[PDB]
Amino acid sequence: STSNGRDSESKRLGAKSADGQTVTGGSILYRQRGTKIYPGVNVGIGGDDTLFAKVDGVVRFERKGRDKKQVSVYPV
Amino acid sequence: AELKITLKRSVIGRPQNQRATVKALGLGKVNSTVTKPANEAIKGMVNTISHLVDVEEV
Amino acid sequence: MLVPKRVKHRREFRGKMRGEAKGGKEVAFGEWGLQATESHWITNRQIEAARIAMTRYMKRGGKVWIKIFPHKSYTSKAIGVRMGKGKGAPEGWVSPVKRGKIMFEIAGVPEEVAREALRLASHKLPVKTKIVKREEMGGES
RNA sequence: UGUGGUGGCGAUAGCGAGAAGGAUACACCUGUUCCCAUGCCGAACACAGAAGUUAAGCUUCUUAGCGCCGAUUGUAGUGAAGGGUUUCCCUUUGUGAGAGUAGGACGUCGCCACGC
RNA sequence: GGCGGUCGCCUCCUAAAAGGUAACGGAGGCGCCCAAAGGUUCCCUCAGAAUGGUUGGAAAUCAUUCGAAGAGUGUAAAGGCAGAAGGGAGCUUGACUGCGAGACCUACAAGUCGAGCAGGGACGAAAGUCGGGCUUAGUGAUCCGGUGGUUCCGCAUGGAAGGGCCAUCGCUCAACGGAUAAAAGCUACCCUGGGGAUAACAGGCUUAUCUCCCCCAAGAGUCCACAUCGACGGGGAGGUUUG
RNA sequence: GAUGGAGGUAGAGCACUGUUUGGACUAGUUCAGAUAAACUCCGAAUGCCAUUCAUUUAUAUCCGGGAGUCAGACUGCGAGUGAUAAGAUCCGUAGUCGAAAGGGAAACAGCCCAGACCACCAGCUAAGGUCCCAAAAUAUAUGUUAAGUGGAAAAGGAUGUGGGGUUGCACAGACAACUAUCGAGUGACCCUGCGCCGAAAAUGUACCGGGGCUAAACAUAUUACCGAAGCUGUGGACUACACCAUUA
């Protein structure tokens, strides 16, 4: 006799490629709610905030001024 | 330079990375030995296994 | 009995004391302290019993500081009821105390009255205790 | 050099208090004819100007009251490896904070234009 | 076991700083809404407090000064947002058609993001942005039936009847991966197969409760805490009671 | 091992939201002190993702034939339900059992040590031990305990004993005792080692396994020995791979 007892399915959010890893065009980098991380050089934002590569290159997580983070992709 | 490494304890009852470290050095049974070069990687393996092992700088 | 007005949550977890006081380990407002040397839960009724005993002994008043507040609630089920359904109904309030915490303070009264009062307060409590004074800083009157 | 403009760097670049200045430039200031404007108002935005003034913005300089950047060594925690009752506590080995402090700090690097 | 509740989907805590993670564990929401509350171009900055002012009061509406956010964000909560995703004004229908390199999630079936190419457009001087809404709930396989299209087939031939392909409609099939188009009770009058995978006595473990023993001592006892009783509180033993 | 990174737990903090104690004040803001699972200005150890990297090591991936399993249990550690009860229940992480013989723990699935191809009347060790049952020290140096504590249990109580500190009063005479002298010391506090009381259950001593123990107990050091189907020695079987000259 309780009125709790329900939850929703987990969504598998987080980072999907690492710093210093080479990546092909279109590959997901980060799933989020809102911009915890921001898009940088050669990276796009999806409709529900996912971050993706536009170009093949290496992934680098950086610092955006004082309190924000960025992902960039740099081709060789 | 080199180190003689002798196995003095058993691997029953230990976790998996310690078993696999004893294997990566090439140590089979109790009192079997091995000789390796002195590196920063081999010293890390010896430091993970120190409670099971005797080491002599040779 | 002390009770918190307006809790945000009706039930909560209990653990995990793992003694060492985080906060007041020195006398702040009085001259004499009562410091717990074991870690345990301390309830509403134990505090009021100790306070009444401590004040009754000090004719001509003085002052007394209670430095321990019951923030966390209890729950419990009833006899004759099998395990299973959700948490019981809340019955009680407590504060966890860890070793080192000073719990009462007295002033305006010489040693022996203060020492007797702190002796009578400790027999009402489930912890071992010491009696401490303000020792030495840049200024202690 | 001085001033106008436009850029990098985590405010060590900021806030407040105080002083000074009009060479060109920047401003305030003066008007609504004409391009445009007010859910009322030429206040703003838009345009035509050049009487007046360094009072305000702007620039330079002093100031560590508020923010900001902060080590060192000590603790709290905790990888590995062991011991008592196992609620909890302890000993070796490695790692090590948050507070609290000694100190830093009243910016630094670059391009263009004009004047000296 | 029955009675009670629950059965799909979303957000938080549990959850041990990647992801994942139980319980008849602790808290809440959904089964839509908007022709603008969508696209795009310009412009704007909040909530309060203090001071004055006629009706007007604490608090309607005016003026100034402080004010990094203490507001708002269609709807729950978390994560985001003052280079706005918050708030005004003009023009509009991209709430487009054919698609799709590559990733994410995952037993399957499904679910999610996507640069870029082609056709034809909206807004803007341009650069450009636009395949609904700050993000994540607002949904239901297949079979069968209805409506519209079609350069497909059509049992000797020409038609027709009928079928296929494309677009869409008919679900509280809510026991929400959906048994059939269609479904409630009694057995003390009972039968077979299994299970100590599961309930009742006795045992075992545990000791909340119960019986007993204590510590402190306000008090009662005319005076006097302890002859006798012992408030508010605290600590144990036992294994006969209810669990 | 080195280098980079994503992320808010253990701390601990009060800037934000709840909960909260004292003081000054006034409108008629302030100074201090706490607290949290759904608080955060902060923030580890470890785990996780990578790398034309390094050193050792031998696996990993792809296609196909054949399965079995979908009741787990206890013990560290960290959480929920419970009463921070259960050999309880439900998750995470490591091991043993399951499917594991052998030594220790009296007897003992799951604890401590260790993984049995076979033969020996050979040797060295592990955990645990060395007075007799029962193999090996009636070992060595220095101390503590008198309670059979060792060999079950709390709040509280007490001139029991060991060690280290802080001091009041003492031969211009102390504390105690004696009326109305005496001729060395005497009180009061702190932390600490080991003991004492508190301590009552049902067939028969009846938790040292027994005898028995004043060390054959406890603390700190030191060296010998015993001890397993672990390792070594001598010989045999079977398999693989390198050697070797065909002969395997």
TrEMBL record, chain A:
Location of the region described as Disordered in the Swiss-Prot/TrEMBL record: 1-21
An annotated Gene Ontology molecular function: structural constituent of ribosome
GO BP: translation
Membrane-crossing residue ranges in chain numbering: none
Keywords: Ribonucleoprotein, Ribosomal protein
GO-annotated cellular components: cytosolic large ribosomal subunit
Family according to the record: Belongs to the bacterial ribosomal protein bL27 family.
Protein name: Large ribosomal subunit protein bL27
Source organism per UniProt: Enterococcus faecalis
Higher taxonomy: Bacteria, Bacillati, Bacillota, Bacilli, Lactobacillales
Residues of the full protein shown: 18 to 93 of 95
From TrEMBL, chain B:
Keyword match Ligase: no
UniProt entry keywords in alphabetical sequence: Ribonucleoprotein, Ribosomal protein
Alphabetized CDD domains for the sequence: Ribosomal_L30
Limits of the Large ribosomal subunit protein uL30-like ferredoxin-like fold domain: 3-53
Keyword Ribonucleoprotein recorded: yes
GO BP terms, alphabetized: translation
Top-level taxonomic group: Bacteria
GO MF annotation terms: structural constituent of ribosome
GO cellular component terms, A-Z: cytosolic large ribosomal subunit
Cited InterPro entries: Ribo_uL30_ferredoxin-like_sf, Ribosomal_uL30_bac-type, Ribosomal_uL30_CS, Ribosomal_uL30_ferredoxin-like
Assembly, per entry: Part of the 50S ribosomal subunit.
NCBIfam families given in the database record: rpmD_bact (TIGR01308)
Family of the protein in this entry: Belongs to the universal ribosomal protein uL30 family.
Protein name: Large ribosomal subunit protein uL30
Organism: Enterococcus faecalis (Streptococcus faecalis)
Automatic annotation (TrEMBL), chain C:
InterPro entries: Ribosomal_uL16, Ribosomal_uL16_bact-type, Ribosomal_uL16_CS, Ribosomal_uL16_dom, Ribosomal_uL16_sf
GO MF annotation list: rRNA binding; structural constituent of ribosome; tRNA binding
One Pfam family in the UniProt entry: Ribosomal_L16
GO CC terms in record: cytosolic large ribosomal subunit
Any one GO biological process: translation
Swiss-Prot/TrEMBL keywords: Ribonucleoprotein, Ribosomal protein, RNA-binding, rRNA-binding, tRNA-binding
Subunit structure: Part of the 50S ribosomal subunit.
Reported function: Binds 23S rRNA and is also seen to make contacts with the A and possibly P site tRNAs.
Similarity comment: family membership: Belongs to the universal ribosomal protein uL16 family.
UniProt name for this protein: Large ribosomal subunit protein uL16
